[PDB]
Amino acid sequence: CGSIVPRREWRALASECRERLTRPVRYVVVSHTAGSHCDTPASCAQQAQNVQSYHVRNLGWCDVGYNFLIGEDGLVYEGRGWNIKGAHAGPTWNPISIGISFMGNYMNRVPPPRALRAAQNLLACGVALGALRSNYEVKGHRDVQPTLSPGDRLYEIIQTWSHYRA
Amino acid sequence: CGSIVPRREWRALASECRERLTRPVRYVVVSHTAGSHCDTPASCAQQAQNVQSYHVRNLGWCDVGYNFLIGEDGLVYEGRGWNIKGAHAGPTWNPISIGISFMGNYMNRVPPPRALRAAQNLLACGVALGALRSNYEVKGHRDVQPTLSPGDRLYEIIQTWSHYRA
Numbered sequence: 420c421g422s423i424v425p426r427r428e429w430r431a432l433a434s435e436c437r438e439r440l441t442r443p444v445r446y447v448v449v450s451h452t453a454g455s456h457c458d459t460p461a462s463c464a465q466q467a468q469n470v471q472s473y474h475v476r477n478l479g480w481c482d483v484g485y486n487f488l489i490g491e492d493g494l495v496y497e498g499r500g501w502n503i504k505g506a507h508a509g510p511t512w513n514p515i516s517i518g519i520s521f522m523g524n525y526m527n528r529v530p531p532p533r534a535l536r537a538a539q540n541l542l543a544c545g546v547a548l549g550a551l552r553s554n555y556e557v558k559g560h561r562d563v564q565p566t567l568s569p570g571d572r573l574y575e576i577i578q579t580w581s582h583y584r585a
Numbered sequence: 586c587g588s589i590v591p592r593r594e595w596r597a598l599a600s601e602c603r604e605r606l607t608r609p610v611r612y613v614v615v616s617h618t619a620g621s622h623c624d625t626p627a628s629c630a631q632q633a634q635n636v637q638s639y640h641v642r643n644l645g646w647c648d649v650g651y652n653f654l655i656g657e658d659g660l661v662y663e664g665r666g667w668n669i670k671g672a673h674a675g676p677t678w679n680p681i682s683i684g685i686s687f688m689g690n691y692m693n694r695v696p697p698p699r700a701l702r703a704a705q706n707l708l709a710c711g712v713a714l715g716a717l718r719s720n721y722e723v724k725g726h727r728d729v730q731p732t733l734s735p736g737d738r739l740y741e742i743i744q745t746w747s748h749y750r751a
């Protein structure tokens with residue numbers, strides 16, 4: 420189920436991450452990268468590389484912090500994926516959640532409909548696979564940490580999701 | 586599901602087609618447009634418009650002939666959809682099959698992995714909502730009509746799909 424740009428196709432550095440998540444997962448945390456937006460497969464693969472680069476090389480994480488990334492190209496970029504604990508929401512939320520990040524800054528722009536679809540589609544895929552609970556809950560990054568993430572314009576949107584829980 | 590770009594989002598003219606498909610549908614025919622290629626959402630939306638516009642204004646059809654279109658942006662473009670008989674494989678095949686078209690000429694080029702993924706994902710999303718049959722059969726366009734569609738290279742690939750039938 421789902422179309423996902425695999426690690427190898429956005430030319431990801433090999434993962435060093437080992438800590439597994441306990442399936443099915445109850446919580447999804449939605450962030451923004453607060454970085455550059457991109458609207459083409461070519462530019463969005465490059466941006467996935469840039470986010471992973473910042474996390475592995477500068478913050479010294481085992482991989483890109485996010486389980487999945489969303490491009491404005493309307494594609495899902497594989498991060499740690501469904502089975503591996505992420506680094507996106509702190510030490511209380513990272514063990515019990517999937518972290519999906521919209522590549523961009525959504526303080527003043529909304530992500531386009533294709534990106535919102537790609538994200539909702541991904542989560543349904545999670546349920547279908549048994550990676551997420553049928554009764555999964557969606558959180559803002561700001562609901563679980565002191566942050567503007569995932570941006571006012573995007574936060575306002577995810578609040579209207581059927582699985583949103585403050 | 587399956588993260589399909591809706592009619593309205595690619596600035597489609599309204600359909601005037603009435604003839605429903607008898608679901609669950611048994612066949613999938615795979616064509617190329619033999620038209621211009623596109624690899625950005627902006628360009629691929631303009632290309633679906635261009636194909637629809639030819640079918641409607643020039644050939645006088647009720648809508649774009651294809652049930653679905655596949656861009657090299659890795660997105661699926663809603664044509665006539667799951668429920669409306671197409672105009673893509675001729676009258677033997679139009680009322681019993683779903684038509685999906687790769688936007689481009691694939692005689693001497695291959696479509697990218699994300700276009701092929703998008704296609705496969707679309708088919709599983711058909712099964713899933715009951716539009717296609719669990720055990721559907723994929724046919725080449727050149728396998729049901731005197732045409733080179735869907736191109737030498739793309740025809741070689743669909744040949745190796747699990748569900749492919751010669």
Ligand SMILES: [Cl-]
Binds near residue numbers: 646647648672
């Ligand atoms: Cl017609």
